[PDB]
Amino acid sequence: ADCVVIEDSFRGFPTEYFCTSPRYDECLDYVLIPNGMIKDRLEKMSMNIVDYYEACNATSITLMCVLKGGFKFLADLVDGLERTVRARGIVLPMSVEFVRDKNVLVVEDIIDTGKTITKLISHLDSSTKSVKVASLLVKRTRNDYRPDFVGFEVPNRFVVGYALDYNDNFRDLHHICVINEVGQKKFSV
Amino acid sequence: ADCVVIEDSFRGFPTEYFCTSPRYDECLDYVLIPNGMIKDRLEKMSMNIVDYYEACNATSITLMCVLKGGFKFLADLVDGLERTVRARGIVLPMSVEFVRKDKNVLVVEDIIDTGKTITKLISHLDSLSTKSVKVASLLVKRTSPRNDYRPDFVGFEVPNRFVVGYALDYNDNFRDLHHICVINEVGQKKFS
Amino acid sequence: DCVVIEDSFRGFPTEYFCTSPRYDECLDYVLIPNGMIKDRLEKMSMNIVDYYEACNATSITLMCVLKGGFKFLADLVDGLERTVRARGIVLPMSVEFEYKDKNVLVVEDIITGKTITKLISHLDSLSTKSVKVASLLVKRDYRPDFVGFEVPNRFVVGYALDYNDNFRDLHHICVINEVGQKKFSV
Amino acid sequence: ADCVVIEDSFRGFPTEYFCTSPRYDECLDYVLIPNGMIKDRLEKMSMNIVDYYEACNATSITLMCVLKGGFKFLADLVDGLERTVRARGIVLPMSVEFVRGLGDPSEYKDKNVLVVEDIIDTGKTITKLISHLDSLSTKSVKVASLLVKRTSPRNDYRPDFVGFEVPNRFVVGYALDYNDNFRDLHHICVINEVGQKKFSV
Ligand SMILES: O=c1[nH]cnc2c1ncn2[C@@H]1O[C@H](COP(=O)(O)O)[C@@H](O)[C@H]1O
Numbered sequence: 118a119d120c121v122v123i124e125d126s127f128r129g130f131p132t133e134y135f136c137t138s139p140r141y142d143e144c145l146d147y148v149l150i151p152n153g154m155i156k157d158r159l160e161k162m163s164m165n166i167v168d169y170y171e172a173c174n175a176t177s178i179t180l181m182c183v184l185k186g187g188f189k190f191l192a193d194l195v196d197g198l199e200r201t202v203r204a205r206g207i208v209l210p211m212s213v214e215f216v217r218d219k220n221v222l223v224v225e226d227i228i229d230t231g232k233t234i235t236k237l238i239s240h241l242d243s244s245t246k247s248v249k250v251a252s253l254l255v256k257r258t259r260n261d262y263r264p265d266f267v268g269f270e271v272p273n274r275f276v277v278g279y280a281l282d283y284n285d286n287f288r289d290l291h292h293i294c295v296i297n298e299v300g301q302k303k304f305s306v
Numbered sequence: 307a308d309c310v311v312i313e314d315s316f317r318g319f320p321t322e323y324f325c326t327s328p329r330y331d332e333c334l335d336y337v338l339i340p341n342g343m344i345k346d347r348l349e350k351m352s353m354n355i356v357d358y359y360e361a362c363n364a365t366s367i368t369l370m371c372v373l374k375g376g377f378k379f380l381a382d383l384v385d386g387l388e389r390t391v392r393a394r395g396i397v398l399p400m401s402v403e404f405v406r407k408d409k410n411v412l413v414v415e416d417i418i419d420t421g422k423t424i425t426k427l428i429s430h431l432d433s434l435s436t437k438s439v440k441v442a443s444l445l446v447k448r449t450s451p452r453n454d455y456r457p458d459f460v461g462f463e464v465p466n467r468f469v470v471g472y473a474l475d476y477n478d479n480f481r482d483l484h485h486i487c488v489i490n491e492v493g494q495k496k497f498s
Numbered sequence: 499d500c501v502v503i504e505d506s507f508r509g510f511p512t513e514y515f516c517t518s519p520r521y522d523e524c525l526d527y528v529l530i531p532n533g534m535i536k537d538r539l540e541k542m543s544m545n546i547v548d549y550y551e552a553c554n555a556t557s558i559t560l561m562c563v564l565k566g567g568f569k570f571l572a573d574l575v576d577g578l579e580r581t582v583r584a585r586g587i588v589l590p591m592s593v594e595f596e597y598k599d600k601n602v603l604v605v606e607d608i609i610t611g612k613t614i615t616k617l618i619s620h621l622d623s624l625s626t627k628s629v630k631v632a633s634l635l636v637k638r639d640y641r642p643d644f645v646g647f648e649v650p651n652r653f654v655v656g657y658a659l660d661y662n663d664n665f666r667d668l669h670h671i672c673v674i675n676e677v678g679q680k681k682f683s684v
Numbered sequence: 685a686d687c688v689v690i691e692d693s694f695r696g697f698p699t700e701y702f703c704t705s706p707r708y709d710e711c712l713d714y715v716l717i718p719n720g721m722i723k724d725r726l727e728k729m730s731m732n733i734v735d736y737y738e739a740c741n742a743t744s745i746t747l748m749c750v751l752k753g754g755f756k757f758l759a760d761l762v763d764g765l766e767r768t769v770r771a772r773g774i775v776l777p778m779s780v781e782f783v784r785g786l787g788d789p790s791e792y793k794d795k796n797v798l799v800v801e802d803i804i805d806t807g808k809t810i811t812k813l814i815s816h817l818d819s820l821s822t823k824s825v826k827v828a829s830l831l832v833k834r835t836s837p838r839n840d841y842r843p844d845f846v847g848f849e850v851p852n853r854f855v856v857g858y859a860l861d862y863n864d865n866f867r868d869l870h871h872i873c874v875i876n877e878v879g880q881k882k883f884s885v
């Protein structure tokens with residue numbers, strides 16, 4: 118459950134020094150997690166997931182992508198998993214299933230209060246071999262729940278980008294950023 | 307449209323000189339298209355798509371992922387489109403819908419052999435009063451006689467041989483392969 | 499102007515990123531992950547191409563200063579090639595590791611500035627047509643024409659940056675501790 | 685069974701379906717090896733090199749790049765090497781040096797040198813180097829060549845690690861040059877006639 122903990126002292130990275138979608142010129146305060154940061158973290162995370170599912174003699178695993186917030190995370194994550202199982206010479210069959218007794222790894226976007234991931238975990242437990250949750254981001258409240266694999270622990274702010282949406286928008290953004298009030302007013306109701 | 311033609315005389319590249327997942331040891335005949343070649347073609351496909359919708363004045367574009375096969379394809383293609391939209395400074399909003407009104411729908415599918423699936427899907431799209439309906443296909447099977455229909459954007463035109471990898475499946479197996487490969491008969495029998 | 503890494507930033511723990519097992523105990527933290535470098539180099543390359551399009555430069559010659567900037571030159575040349583290629587412009591590029599009267603973009607690793615002064619001074623012998631300098635990192639006052647990150651006055655390794663021809667194979671840009679700083683003393 | 689063989693029947697891919705430097709628009713016949721295919725090959729090459737130098741417990745391993753021609757191949761090769769060593773917990777200390785010869789210590793002795801060159805054709809350019817390296821009392825001298833030209837008759841020398849075996853046509857791109865041009869090209873291509881006349885000696 119230990120991860121890259123973004124402290125509330127971190128002010129982020131201003132958008133002017135990166136490549137963001139020109140569509141969101143005035144709508145972003147700063148970049149929180151660059152895209153390459155996400156990739157680099159997902160490498161080590163892929164190693165952790167693989168060696169965990171080898172410590173337990175798992176015959177196979179099935180990733181469950183929760184659309185549409187976890188697609189980029191699932192894509193890069195599957196790249197890292199196939200890469201790791203490729204280099205290490207293991208024979209670990211992985212399946213991918215998208216939803217809006219087998220080993221199930223939930224591929225989620227972010228945990229805020231946990232009311233959504235717990236209904237899923239209780240939905241698959243309604244007779245499954247195993248149920249695990251992997252979340253790219255985690256929100257620091259503290260919440261009583263934590264996923265099994267966590268990439269980043271972020272402050273109590275609303276983030277967008279990397280297929281994370283603020284009212285069905287900002288998904289085509291390359292990095293993980295925090296909206297300001299201008300974009301909030303522009304894309305909310 | 308015109309694309310990279312994988313000639314029938316192409317013998318492929320043997321899997322031993324690339325990285326294959328260990329679970330398909332004696333199941334792959336050869337490697338037809340390496341992953342990196344797919345990506346390098348997807349760069350040009352992204353440019354073609356973006357400046358097509360820029361020749362038009364599309365207010366947005368809605369990509370339709372045809373699951374489960376087109377998921378890697380849609381991933382790297384969305385990376386290409388995003389990378390050329392922000393590289394040319396053009397404002398062009400892109401949304402992503404998934405399957406298994408009055409918008410510019412770009413269908414993203416894995417391969418087209420006969421065209422039954424793409425015909426049914428396109429017919430379903432024609433009822434919702436879409437602004438435009440274009441189709442982007444990664445692979446196109448060269449059949450005899452040549453198939454009556456061809457997509458608006460095509461990555462590779464490959465021979466009439468069953469291919470797997472890059473999320474191309476064979477009874478929900480072979481998806482976790484990095485490259486597009488032709489199966490042998492031992493692998494076709496191994497999964498039934 | 500670039501990305502400023504303030505001094506109150508402790509970095510990220512090495513145990514959360516993939517690092518070479520060679521330097522298990524010799525790394526305090528990571529300042530800048532590798533992918534963040536890759537994402538900043540996009541904007542930096544765009545800035546360089548835009549400066550060489552404000553005027554009509556008919557050529558550009560990148561000067562790699564081995565051994566520190568070979569990774570930075572690799573990904574920088576990749577970004578420049580990808581930008582020139584993406585914008586359909588005809589910007590011919592050469593790499594220089596006797597070829598004079600050319601626009602020079604010096605690709606150095608990090609800058610006191612006493613080394614870059616030796617570079618620019620040595621350039622006056624051939625009299626280049628134009629000289630500009632781009633550096634990946636700057637430690638805390640002089641500034642090159644293109645800067646990527648601004649780091650504290652601490653010591654950084656990785657990404658071909660070396661402490662006595664060492665730590666170059668490290669993927670990310672890290673900060674070492676005193677035990678590692680003494681385990682590779684010259 | 686040394687490497688990927690690009691048979692003489694292979695006609696390549698037309699340059700219009702890939703992203704090419706627009707200045708060489710009319711100078712390229714076709715694309716021989718796309719960039720991503722090169723990197724895909726360099727994954728497996730990195731694995732082979734790593735487990736070779738680990739099977740014999742090589743203390744140090746020093747990659748020597750033949751400069752200008754072999755730079756990009758060195759960069760992607762080092763990428764793959766550090767990646768595959770990172771994913772295995774292996775400790776394999778690698779160094780990097782460069783040559784054009786322009787590199788001398790003379791402490792190269794007792795070390796394991798891995799030569800990183802761009803392409804082998806006749807074999808004399810590399811033979812002079814291996815002769816100049818086996819004179820410094822090195823523990824081992826091996827060569828990694830990205831491309832190898834198919835010669836008639838077959839060349840009496842084949843490097844230890846080969847990426848691709850290409851037909852006997854002239855190739856450019858991916859730091860491969862023709863009269864110090866075509867280096868900024870992204871893929872490995874073959875020059876046509878207009879490109880052969882546009883950069884003559
Ligand atoms: O900061 C955010 N940005 C975008 N979506 C969020 C954010 N925080 C929570 N969500 C979404 O809120 C939903 C429920 O999260 P919960 O509050 O943990 O139950 C999920 O779909 C999350 O992706």
Ligand SMILES: O=c1[nH]cnc2c1ncn2[C@@H]1O[C@H](COP(=O)(O)O)[C@@H](O)[C@H]1O
Nearest residue numbers: 375418419420421422423468469474475
């Ligand atoms: O060779 C193949 N390998 C894997 N899937 C194929 C192949 N050929 C056709 N398909 C599948 O066939 C479906 C539609 O093809 P069609 O109906 O023949 O046009 C798609 O969902 C493809 O995944």
Ligand SMILES: O=c1[nH]cnc2c1ncn2[C@@H]1O[C@H](COP(=O)(O)O)[C@@H](O)[C@H]1O
Nearest residue numbers: 566607609610611612613653654655660
């Ligand atoms: O923190 C560091 N780690 C490794 N090398 C450094 C570091 N800081 C400066 N250098 C090297 O110091 C030399 C000159 O730097 P300058 O004195 O700031 O101009 C160059 O070779 C740099 O690579």
Ligand SMILES: O=c1[nH]cnc2c1ncn2[C@@H]1O[C@H](COP(=O)(O)O)[C@@H](O)[C@H]1O
Nearest residue numbers: 753804805806807808809854855860861
């Ligand atoms: O087809 C080619 N394209 C570009 N450079 C080549 C080609 N063939 C050989 N070279 C270069 O010319 C020299 C030929 O070496 P040799 O023929 O093995 O003795 C080496 O420096 C090669 O890098």
